[model samples]
Target chain A: GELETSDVVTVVLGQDAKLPCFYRGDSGEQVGQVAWARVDAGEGAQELALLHSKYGLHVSPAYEGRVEQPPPPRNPLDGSVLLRNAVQADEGEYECRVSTFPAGSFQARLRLRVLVPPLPSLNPGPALEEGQGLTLAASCTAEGSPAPSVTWDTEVKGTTSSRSFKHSRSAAVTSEFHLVPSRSMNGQPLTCVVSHPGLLQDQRITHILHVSHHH
Target chain B: GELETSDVVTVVLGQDAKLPCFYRGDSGEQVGQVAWARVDAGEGAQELALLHSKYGLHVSPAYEGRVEQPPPPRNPLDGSVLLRNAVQADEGEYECRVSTFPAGSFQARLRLRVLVPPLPSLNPGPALEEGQGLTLAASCTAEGSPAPSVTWDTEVKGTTSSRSFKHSRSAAVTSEFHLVPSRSMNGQPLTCVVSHPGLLQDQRITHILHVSHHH
Candidate 1:
């Protein structure tokens, strides 16, 4: 039950990342099997790995070809793995368990994050016909490692829809937005921005809404 | 530069979840983007859509044909987005913001609740049985959040119920596991882990089976 969590590890998308296991401290001796597992973001710490272990350098079937044990069996000091092709899906909490005959169970948790390069694009919606009342909608897509976030740089209420899919080694994200049109807004620019930890800063794209003549 | 929350709205799965957007009075000026973004339904609430005055309409790929704006964009009174085919995952707090260049920004928050009913409960049946190898049955119910996953703290096998109860804003879920009972199970702690999010941790309920001679 005795577990220890280490500092978080962040890597860019499609890059290799190593999660350290055995801490190089006094950490007793006569260790058991050391394994790595992707923990569900819930109360149970639900393990979703296929699961990884160091007995024979085993890998979970689901993570095969992606996560690996970095070199020479159980390290006398620290146990770490080289996570290849980091993806948005790979962005989560990871656990490394090392059992020792005397020290009981030496456990450590680390949050893994995948960085993303900005690929934000904003597309405008239909013409707002000048009328007593009306509404319009637009959409934006931002590609990042850990599911990028999209927000309106402007000040208005619009509906948003977002999702992420594995794009080989990285994650692709997209969001749709909507807003009401007014006679005054026919000339200005509307901007959509994507924010992610991996991104140096929020990436933004802007477009103008075409209004239907009436006003 | 502003936002507020109001009465919670509950919706059933696969139903439409519409979020309304209206500036709290004061308008008639250059307005920014009136976009809808899910603030915390995970993945940073990617802006689902946007309605620009000069540009055409735009919709995210995933929600492209699914989400829509009912009224014309020219409505100065309202800007709302309809999230069609709402799923349990759609349940969360939503925010609508209205911002004017000179007037400033405003926001409102609302919660979307999806009451999830418990699944079929799976408890060991008739623990007292007279036989060499007697088969036992235990039914478990999965409840609350993210397709609640069911697991057993004790070593056993189980089959998830293919059917799930729906049609309402929430759901009733149940799963039955089949296992053979033996004398070794007497007084042993058989914990059924539902991982209830209501408790914020691995919610577990344990039961001791009476294995003797009631035959």
Candidate 2:
């Protein structure tokens, strides 16, 4: 049988919101087609966002520029859609409908949530040594919901490695560089980068490292 | 003793360029300052782009905004700079100056090559059942100077597990989603996202799975 569900999601201005919907069925055997619809209080009726079947994705004009299936609909198992750059018009109840062979029809609903976070700030850690084993930590401890991911970068060293730890309100990330100190490691720079999931804002802090003598 | 070395190198546009420099000194010796300066041709020796110990980054107004040091100064052992979004103006000899106990500096020139690769495209492969003990495969092939990396989304039921083969021109990555096919595996979508080191652009391809009674 076909089933559907939606939760009330909110978002802030000029941010991206990820509305989630789930479905279960044999996409290959699915009869007619699988589609998603958006319904706002103003519209009163469901507006088709995207449709897919044996043919392919038939995206609606209204969503052409903004709507994208993050991974796109490659397999029947992939049913989630990723909407980029959201505005007030995108606020409302969203539904996922799928039609399959013997299963008939099913649908799911998702609530939209959108909120803007303050400009991200980066707090850079101390310089590390190569092979000396040091941690480059940065905090995106800004004011926002769902927190953000802190990234580490460098003008000298590209993104070597990074790890993010999330809390209730904010997130922190650390880039670990493990290697023995060498003359080559002297004077390179490291940077801590921060970004919010909803708001398209980022900040970075840079620092320099002075390696100690090896012998 | 304080010593310095400066050399000339070339970099291509639209490609990732590495500025290599090294310094030798004792450990624990405070690194007073580190800087990268671009010498302008017509402007004379005006310290076009200067990154200092206190200022963090100071690019010539001309090369402002575009130049970035993904990795900042770290330990004394690591001494190389990775510049993204390289431009023609980023050409010429650059100095990597490090002020340590005795103060020593080593500089390398960069020749930028702005090679724009054809847009990346994806080629999807056949879908496999969950329990049928099958291997899912997809290829993201692009023509570029330094090849790109292939990544997958969460729902893909696989990992960036292995690499088939790679050369200077191209790289092929193989990921597998090994599992016992169940109804849950049906309809889920898998994607192949490809990206280059310097280019900010990315491409993705999606594929869906099909369930059968035989499984």
Candidate 3:
């Protein structure tokens, strides 16, 4: 018999985390107990929960309300567990231990990466008219941990100003693009790109410049 | 432009090793130069070779005899290299740097693992008669760098004795099975299983017993 588990499991911040573990053995063999623990660097492992055939699951007080092994009607050999509302601090290496009567015990390791995707918003500015002096075209803002970068992508002749703000668990950045409106700028594309490590790809907000030619 | 490379490359000891690196970029962009370096744990990086457009390829004196960026008649952006006669010492993390004129330089890391699989041999003992007293049934021997374990699997009653020997770069293990011959032991299967880290699966050799019913 052998233990099987995933190498890594990723979850967005505040979402539940599912760490899978299963013991695959002979038809006649049976599992005695299963346990999950977190391996904190330098500090060693801390037990999170234990599932025993006689007494059922016993979750450690430290993880009392946040950890659980899926209940009844499940396969007897399923050693997977779920963590409620996983946070950044919960991201790390986890070990699963499975014990069988005659086979002794088997274990496996799994890694967790918690992601915090940026929440982005764009504030389109005032109506544009030809010959309008320097004015704000639009403002785009994004909030996320590890901070996010904002960039402007456009053919229009304009410059951007950016500001960063730090919060307890996340950072926010806002970028504003300004330019003098001209009839030639009408129908031009103005795009704000927000880039973050947690984002699979840059989040973009595109807007078309509408300039009024009539006085 | 971005650099693309494998996370790890595995090669058998004494075999040639290929480290791949490629620059994926816009159709208009072109790679200017490529360089490879070996990163030792605490001492930092040591340059292995440099491939420059104006000066051609240059191999460092330390790696002069065994390293090379595959010769021309290949893709301009292919930065892969070949290491001849790879040994255990050559296994480690390698950095591939690709430089694009306007884009500057991009890098990727690749790890190398040199493997030494065990070589196994089995020796079957003499013919058996039903009334024979204790006798040697068979012997299994295996040689590997990380050492290998030998085990016997059979229906015939027997006991195994094992011995390990250390070699310059490899370890050898020999296991012998002893049993008393009987009529019931005829046509029985004797299996020698050799297991090693470098082997994807255990190497097994099976032999059938022939027992003479009468003297």
Candidate 4:
């Protein structure tokens, strides 16, 4: 008999992640018990849940509210567990162990990766004024766990520069596009494109330039 | 012209990681400037190095000591940088931008992943003696980032249990094997097997038992 589980599981932030575990026997074999634990770096891993043939199911106090039970009619052989509202703290490895009849015990490990989508925004530079030598035209910013890439799209001739910052769980980035203010660049579209692994499409923010001239 | 860089660069803890960046053009193209920066979360990213067509090369004071310069005779268009003795704080995304003659400016991003290996050890339990009810025989401990799995191997007919603790950068695990001591178990080998992604091979520590009866 062998215990089987996913080697790795991924989920988006604030979503539920299902960690699958099961016993692979010759079939119809007897399973004694199943236990799941979240590994830690000190003291030891915290036991999350346990399933017994006669004693029934038990969920740990810390995870009681979030641990879901199997359907009333479904077999308990499936030791899968669902984690609700996954967070950055939930990004780690989990262990699932199964005790069987004559074969003894088997275990498997799985890692969880949580994806955080970037929140992107574009702020217009203080009203572009004509005749200005060179000034910031627009500023684009975004923050994410794996970090996001920022780029500018505009017909106006300018130079783009970027900077990044560190956060507890994510990285932040700001890209600035600067150019000489002129009437020809008035009403031009300055777009900021943010790309991250968590988003299906690149997030874009367009700000129409309003140049103040003699008028 | 297009900028090229590795999507992700991985290295073991305390080792050097090479972040590659280059110009992917049709050839015979003139590169103006190449700049590199390490992203941050506060004000902005810190400029690490810059290579200009006329100004030779300039390395930032913050990274001057660790940033390796290219061969004096080698082509300066490579734009690659070597980060020496990378620490946990160095794990993040880096940007490399190349300014070309006609193509303007193009940039690319690459992430750095650091692997920390676990240190495993086995401690002998209070001298095992015959006639003792169930007693701890041996304990195996290991610590590493991403966590490591611990298992015991012995024909001593014992039960194995494990615990984990949390650390800043790594997770620690301890597995204890316990059983009734007997003369038959004397000189037997109690081996702790540790497996982790950072380790090329499973780390094993064997502790020979010396069970005392009356002799």
Candidate 5:
């Protein structure tokens, strides 16, 4: 039997994330060391560090100073590691490997997911006239994991459009409404709604329409 | 001297991807068995051990049938492994380890990326009766990487736009085109176009209007 890893771990804002790597050894042989590495989708893996008993810890240059581990326990089973000040960039899977003479090698994996509610923004969009084939656009943007959804809620009659673009592990969403503003519809209300799994509920922002009269 | 690995490997759907790993020895020492393992970001690496010299191969039940080795060169230094039927779950880090007499062991890491194109669909939107505050909504959806772009193409002279959403390693995009259709605008053309880097060009779907007349 080998060690086991924790289920997916989640971190928020500027917080620390714990990667649980608990060892369940059956081999009577003494343990040599345990190493941790990153597993990114299609990006491959990068060596983070190796925790040795006598020599202590030797970390990779890329993750140097960022990773920290607690003192080894008497049984030497817990292989967990701590990631300090976890940022949006820390989201992904991590693998822990333990090597012993009798058992050879054993490993476990843990997944880290970071959450961020994008800062909402409203764009006034293109200018509009009362008539004569004029165009008017209004949009809002937000970012998060599962990527936030942007939808328009307006009383004025017009066409609606929305889309999202990925930013590493998370995504940024934007929604816009298109229309030909009319004089009677001046001061109409247009709303942008943002939704994400990370957020407690749907987020929203609204802008008032002020169509200039056609001269 | 050092463990060598490919910079990065890309994989397409329904295809095979090989992560190349090799060893460069300076000690003139004979090589031992080579092992392949999956490395996660938080957990320790898990050995695949799908290869051996005299003992044959022993793949993990998880990666059993799908992972295989190419022909070796006696004591072949190239320790690459091939993954069959590329999928999103297969995207991650793989470590290759080789044992040496004096140097103990040498290992290298390689990254794998997988790409998938979206299948698009279109909707005709809400049914409308001529002249009634008539707010008709039609939407288009497509799946792709990094969130594909969604836009509308129409001639009905109303407001319209597009947006994208997160879908694991890929994205699910939807664009809605809204309008107030009248008898004069019957049979107007409304199209939705989707685009992504994974896709060669834009993919589109269209709909024709059939507004009901008021009694």
Candidate 6:
């Protein structure tokens, strides 16, 4: 039997999305199996997405590699599945089915949504004064269907800005520049850059170093 | 170059231990390799136990399968080796060596200890009451160098006795049994058991179901 739930769940492409499904039933009945199916858009019929019996079933080809069933059934009464690594194509009505003897079958439905992220860009700060050691920071940020990664160029000569990374629900990257006052870095260029799969060109920002002996 | 660190760690048989070795140097320096050797009860000179460098080695046959190195050298300023999955025979002085560019070598030593924990037993509560709906619980506990797992047997048939398992940081397994109490559960048996690799025999407890009714 189907239970009413939220009709829409927004998610970023390439990231994980959780589709929640629940049911209520008589205690002590032998709950035999649970499965999930995707209903094709504009089509009245249902297409099998995932199935599990005593021995699981032949998963649909479209979701074969990407879909996974986590939290295996510890007991017949435990009916839950977690799908990882969700993608845009995974959007649609997902039906959860249960099998029981003589009682026939019961099913429920959930909706999924995927969104694209924005491209990221980095910006570097000014140069240092004479005899001053500087701290160089860079941020890698992007937005797309799913969140992307921001990492430093390990091959670069300087130490990784502070050796720590912070993450948020939204995708973005930023690093700061710190150095004692120095003149050698004057007029030197600093850069901030961003990358994402959806964008053809990577975004970059450049700034000239400026150092003042007085301040 | 060897950094200052304490020497000698004592361990018990059939247990796990951690051997720590630290070195100080910048990336890509010409430091000589390091190695560990076991000295026989009466022997004075050291017999190689393990080596770290181009060709690392694990000397003790008992530790052959368990030794591992944590990730290394991500930056130019870090040098440390971590050995995991330690056993009693792995107890001994581990030498850290460094070869200099001009044909000079340096060494440092460390001791190891392995300690084991005690075995655990479970206690299952009384049987659930009929028609009263109750929560059933079972516990499987053990103490050892490394903890173990607890599992349920699925061959038995019962209505309303649903179960779940959880592992805590102290390495104890708690199995929760929940169900709607019914007449059929009278005299039914519930069990809690423990299992570990080094355990000679499994520990278990069985509880008889008892239901009380008011006339």
> Which one wins on DockQ?
5
lDDT of 2: 0.52
For each candidate, the alpha-carbon lDDT, in order, equals 0.59, 0.52, 0.81, 0.79, 0.72, 0.49
* Candidate 5 residue lDDT tens string, A139-175: 7888777777788877787887678788767788777
The CAPRI category of model 4 is incorrect
In model 5, the number of clashes is: 33
Q: lDDT tens digits, residues A131-214, model 6?
A: 456554333344444444334432223444422233433444444545554565466665555455544565565655666564
Native contacts matched by each model: 0.00, 0.00, 0.00, 0.00, 0.00, 0.00
A140-175: candidate 3 lDDT, tens digit per residue? 999887788888999999878989999876789999
lDDT per residue, candidate 1, B12-125, as tens digits?
555677776755445444444354556764566655655433332345555678777765654543556777877777677776644334443345677776644344355666
Interface RMSD of each: 27.6, 30.8, 28.6, 32.4, 8.7, 28.0
lDDT by residue for model 6 (B99-182), tens: 332223345666664544446565555545554544554444555544555555422343333233333323444454555555
Model 5 misplaced regions, further than 4 Å: A1-215, B24-30, B41-44, B71-75, B101-104, B129-134, B161-163, B167-169, B213-215
Assess the local accuracy of residue B91 in candidate 5 as a C-alpha lDDT between 0 and 100.
77
Candidate 4 local lDDT, B1-215, one digit each (tens):
67778999998888888878878776666565567777676648877776555444566677766777545565656678788888777778888966554444567889888878889989988988886878898899999876899999777899988999988778899999998899999989989999988788999999998788854
- TM-score, model 6 to reference: 0.28
Residue range A32-70, candidate 1, lDDT tens digits? 345566777565544332221222344555666776666
TM-score of chain B of each: 0.49, 0.41, 0.67, 0.84, 0.78, 0.40
Location of the lowest summed lDDT over 10 successive residues in candidate 4 chain B: B97-106
Tens-place lDDT digits, model 4, residues A95-156? 88665544545679899989898989888787778867789888999999789999998888
Q: Give the range where candidate 2 chain A is weakest over 10 consecutive residues by summed lDDT.
A: A133-142
Ranking by lDDT: 3, 4, 5, 1, 2, 6
